[PDB]
Amino acid sequence: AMITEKSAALYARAVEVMPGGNSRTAVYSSPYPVYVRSGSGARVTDVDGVERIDFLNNSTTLIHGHAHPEMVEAIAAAVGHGTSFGMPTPVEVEYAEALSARNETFEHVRFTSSGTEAVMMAVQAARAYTERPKIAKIAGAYHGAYDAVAVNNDGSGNLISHAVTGNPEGVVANTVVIPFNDPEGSLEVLRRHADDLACVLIDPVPWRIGLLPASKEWLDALREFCDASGAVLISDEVGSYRVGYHGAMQLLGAEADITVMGKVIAAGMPIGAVAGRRRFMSVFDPSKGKPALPHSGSYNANPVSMSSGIASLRLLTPQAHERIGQLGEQARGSMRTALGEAGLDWEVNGLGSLFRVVANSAPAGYDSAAAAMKALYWKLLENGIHIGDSGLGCISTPMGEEEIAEYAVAFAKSLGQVLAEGRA
């Protein structure tokens, strides 16, 4: 049914100049992905001219959807004054104040060009502050490609370290993993390494292991352990910040030492941020001699990304936050009803404007739950909707009741088609 000829032609060119025609693993699909030309509001038009509602929003980055007029105005004006400089600008100060105001723990901030960089610098900061080597992270959680955190980062709960080909033992031996939401099992691992732990790195709502929130009992156990041991508690909220108006830890009743942010904080332009209590951030301070931790980067705090951020935060009011949460609750409820009516036990998880369909059974005609979910992803594309290929999705502020209603119709239709094709 779908026409993807212009996508296929782009792919044929791409494979000659990129490895497998790809520049970002997560956007690839076999045999080739759909390529897109433009977006407006909640919708994206592919290169074959087909307009669809976007329910993933650049991996949850685009909290204000595509080309929001107020963001476009702010970004284009900044571009016109100069894209980047070898000197700081007024907008970096304005934006640091705006971000710092969102949570009491965000006392001092520094900007990067990506969440990947920000996680790296947060880990480096903890290592510099403590002068200890090890880090603990959640088994299965993703934090980007930096080698110390690219360990057990693919959704598995396995507690044995597992890393990318070529990541040396000298790196891997200094990262250990803990079981999400299991305080007892987590403390067993943490206490074995306490003297040597620089940090405990968490995501409070990690999607790859199911998009369930961290529990109070687990957060409290980790906070107490960090206080007793001197390890720094780092909350990577690059993806999960958006669940709360003051971020994810605050929504769940807890405080990080350092928080890593990105994605929605600029809602489409390259950025990351490290924000935390002054003492932890002091490793970066260059004002009283050489810093313990140098941290540069050509685009850090560039005024285009800062202007995107100012506009994103200004649009992300308490009212807007509440509204996209209500739409998210409605979407999750409708998915659960459709799954139930189709005889499927799959979970629908999420908080606020985030959701994930977690396929946990293989219906007839599919070799695995993951293959059935990939089929649902493709059927949803055919039926006018973009979600993730393992069930992730999200609401954007240009959406209203009609987009969520259209999604519900498409979701039920698509599920029926997936199941019928499997039984055929």
Next chain:
Amino acid sequence: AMITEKSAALYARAVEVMPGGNSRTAVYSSPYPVYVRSGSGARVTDVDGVERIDFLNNSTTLIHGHAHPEMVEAIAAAVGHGTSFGMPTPVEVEYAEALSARNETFEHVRFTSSGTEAVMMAVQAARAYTERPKIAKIAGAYHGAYDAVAVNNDGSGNLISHAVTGNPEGVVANTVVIPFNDPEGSLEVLRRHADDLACVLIDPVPWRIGLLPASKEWLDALREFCDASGAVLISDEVGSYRVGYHGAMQLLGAEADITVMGKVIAAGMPIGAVAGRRRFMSVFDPSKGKPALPHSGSYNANPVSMSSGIASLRLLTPQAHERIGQLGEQARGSMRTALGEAGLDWEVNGLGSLFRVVANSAPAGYDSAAAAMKALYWKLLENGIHIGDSGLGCISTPMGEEEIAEYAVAFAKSLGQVLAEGRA
């Protein structure tokens, strides 16, 4: 003489929300840096309203200067169609072809959001391809903050490993350093580690150790060593690419296995690139199963950065390249004449549109060569010119003969003031 009151007021706000009021170590100056508001062409206007000629251009990023009208048009149009997407776009393919065309070795490309990320991914690729742990880099050369390369990265030629506080031994033990332009001493180190070397990471024209080019004898020794040992030869040209129309290795008569690029390739928007022969890049290919080296990132290949890149490369013609090289030669000659007339032995190095004044003596009244150069940096600011605080500078394509003439007058004046103030 200089009025910096609006800069001081921005700094007073900044210190409350950033560590030492800073987000990028390299742009800090004591007691505070000059803040800037906008740029146009070759000039930048500070927050106090003072327009100066920019001879550093965001650490050599802005090859086309500030807010070039053709770059602004391309970038603003891209922004209007959507800043980033969870799907590939036509412009990533167009830009990959444009970049790949610049050098025969750039067979397959992948994009990142920074040179820092690109260097990290190049090293990871070499480790994945070879399954060996160690890397060799130049003693003193900078490659960004990634921990494996943030070793001996501050201009010193010392051959003993030296790293940032907190970088663990498990990282540092797998990075060794070699003496720039000393084939004999380099091969002594390399041969000690040959069985375990994933890569030899060079910059062919590293500024922090003097902005002298790699010699043919040294490049040949490294190429031969990599061919014999199986280590990957990685050329980090994030800063030095611009010396040649086909990049730095090609200008100097050599071939890398993988080249890292950034800065001028998009001339102001966040980017990096890893480009190399297909076999080395194959670790990233996701088209025939899971890749050996996953590599994602929310802004990879985003259409704003791709459009900046297309426009930057289209403006960077052979004619434009030759012209900025002629202006660079003229600027370097005028600096040497002024230094000679002032009785100073400082070097002026560089190729093409890059230069660096390398202070190597402490004139009367200065505690060090570095302090005298910092004084020259501040005097040049007072006299209407931005350069780096350790002597780095560069030409941009909006410059012509009048900017280089004004620079020469300011440089001679400033040098006289520095020396007279020291003798007073």
